[PDB]
Ligand binder design. Structure first.
Ligand SMILES: CN1CCN(S(=O)(=O)c2ccc(-c3cnc(N)c(C(=O)Nc4cccnc4)n3)cc2)CC1
Ligand SMILES: CN1CCN(S(=O)(=O)c2ccc(-c3cnc(N)c(C(=O)Nc4cccnc4)n3)cc2)CC1
Lengths: 350, 350
């Protein structure tokens, strides 16, 4: 087809530009950010995604700087980057050449919902564990994704590999530095975000990941609503009314404003009867009002819900082996090095 | 048919309870709030809506107190109210017996977009004018609806009467008193709300009203997005980048956080070519970054876009007369009494 040849800089490593030739340029996404294309590397025959955003003349691209720092099996890799012409004349465009992962947790969960089915629990375990590994990794650099939602979780249906994507909202969170509260998509926003907190931490991603878990288990979003108000009612219905101190922890200025008094609903009454107790236990520990009381991504990987993945004889339903699960680095283990005793099972050590 | 007899207090006037009998109970809606039923009054045959919410007696219902004050032709009337049960031998429900209006702006606008059509501008004029009258009225009492959206705008398809509903988020806004920023539904939220302002005014309803106008004209929401971030990009694309003073006016603490540089897009380039210049002019004056620069509901009623409604020969497409449009009260006119010279046309009710 129509072959495009560009001189791109590799994402990581030495700044040694390379001629990158690609064909079959189709559009796979549009949004506020710009456009995401799919293309085939002429060379390898390999599929890649090209995220084309507009170059802000004032400052360096925040997403590019973040992408460049990262190398994880559960995060979409920045292969190359280059500058181009774009849609608007006399305007500069940044092109991020990324890994292409064919499906999204959103499309997959939606097939199941439409077919009146739930995603088999083994997939919920595989997908969730991989999400927490990606979060453990980025969090270790002080980076918060800030937009964890099923649409941002890519899947390879054959390998059962999950890859986090969209670093457009990602930011390095520094204690004492304030941050915008209007980030994060509806249904997945932590209560602190709803209350307009600007002092929130990376625990917002853990809340969001818990909302993904509960949705994969329920077959629909756990906390829906078209306003913060409706979302808060759904949270209160499940978690009970937040205490004076719980509210103080999220946003302090919001301690006076009153909410309806609903009793702490049992999580066992939330999900269907054949739901594993460990799935429920995980939810309750991820979906906490107090941001400091939520599990960390690395502590969630070590949870009993993921024990099946740590079994030596664990196999995918298609007969294939499970993907990489125990190749933890010192960087990803940094928040709690002693967790490796659980994380890396005896079989992975041999 | 089950006949239910209750002892209910009339919405307005003397607190003199009476026996109200109704039949043909049917659920018309479910939400965070509770349930909305449709029923028929035995003695009149009149269809009514019953909004049933759980009431904790450790406070008086805010919506009920607001409803009881209100009496406007473009607002759903509280006919009666009463207490009953539904779920538990302690659980007490407040029941609000309201006017039943058969359709919604949401459902009407959706027929047209599925049909690849726009709502004829006469209906846009009739529906919008009536919405602004309802807003002029409530605002005169210091009450802000706080949830203006097509689903909360009811229509009678035969009379072309619009009635505002859902006072569940409504609040009397007192200057200096802070308010929650998590009110108002996605697409319709004023930028100040997105920025987490707690010092916002009734001008949030005017922003929301403008979003409804632009949607009725476009055939789709003007500022979509699943996050505040995406919504803000859509606003910036249309209104241009907000100046530091414009940002200061909305929420002051967010003056430091930077946005992409988009040039002020012409409002004429936003809508289809056969859009009336007065419709676009109205939008530009409703959809202002500066809350104090937005038209007031009463000033919007007097805009050139609504002139056709003030014509003595205007008639509905079905051959019927236009509904009540000029029965303004001193209460309704209080924000600007001289506006009545435009508002009440020469031919109006003698
Ligand atoms: C060709 N088809 C298009 C329809 N889909 S989809 O909507 O399920 C889908 C959409 C995007 C991707 C994808 C693949 N690789 C990527 N690397 C990215 C990506 O980085 N996306 C992204 C999106 C928003 C902001 N930033 C980045 N997306 C995969 C499937 C199936 C495939
Ligand atoms: C059988 N159909 C049900 C589907 N619709 S609808 O969705 O278009 C519709 C929904 C609600 C009403 C309605 C009528 N009168 C009311 N008075 C209320 C009302 O007060 N609603 C409300 C909603 C949320 C919170 N508080 C109040 N709603 C009318 C049509 C048409 C008729």
């Amino acid at each position: 087809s129509k072959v495009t040849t560009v001189v791109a800089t590799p994402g990581q490593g030495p700044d040694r530009p390379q001629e990158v030739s690609y064909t079959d340029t189709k559009v796979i996404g549009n949004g506020s950010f710009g456009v995401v294309y799919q293309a085939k590397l002429c060379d390898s025959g390999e599929l890649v995604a090209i995220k084309k955003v507009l170059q802000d003349k004032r400052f360096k691209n925040r997403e590019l700087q973040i992408m460049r720092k990262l190398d994880h099996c559960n995060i979409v890799r920045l292969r190359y980057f280059f500058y181009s012409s774009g849609e608007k004349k006399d305007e500069v465009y940044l092109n991020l050449v990324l890994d292409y992962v064919p499906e999204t947790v959103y499309r997959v969960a939606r097939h199941y919902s439409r077919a009146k089915q739930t995603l088999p629990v083994i997939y919920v375990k595989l997908y969730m564990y991989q999400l927490f590994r990606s979060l453990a990794y980025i969090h270790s650099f002080g980076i918060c994704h800030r937009d964890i939602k099923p649409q941002n979780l890519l899947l390879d249906p054959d390998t059962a590999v999950l890859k986090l994507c969209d670093f457009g909202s990602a930011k390095q969170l520094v204690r004492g530095e304030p941050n915008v509260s209007y980030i994060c998509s509806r249904y997945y926003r932590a209560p602190e975000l709803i209350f307009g907190a600007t002092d929130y931490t990376s625990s917002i991603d853990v809340w969001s990941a818990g909302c993904v878990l509960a949705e994969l288990l329920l077959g629909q979003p756990i906390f829906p609503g078209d306003s913060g108000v409706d979302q808060l009612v759904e949270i209160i219905k499940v978690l009970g009314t937040p205490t004076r101190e719980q509210i103080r922890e999220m946003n302090p200025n919001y301690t006076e404003f009153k909410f309806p008094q609903i009793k702490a609903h049992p999580w066992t009454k939330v999900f269907r009867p054949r739901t594993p107790p460990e799935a429920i236990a995980l939810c309750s520990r991820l979906l906490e009002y107090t941001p400091t009381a939520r599990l960390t991504p690395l502590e969630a990987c070590a949870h009993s819900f993921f024990d099946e993945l740590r079994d030596p004889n664990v196999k995918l339903p298609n007969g294939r082996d499970t993907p990489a699960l125990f190749n933890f680095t010192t960087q990803e283990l940094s928040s709690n090095p002693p967790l490796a005793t659980i994380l890396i099972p005896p079989h992975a050590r041999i």
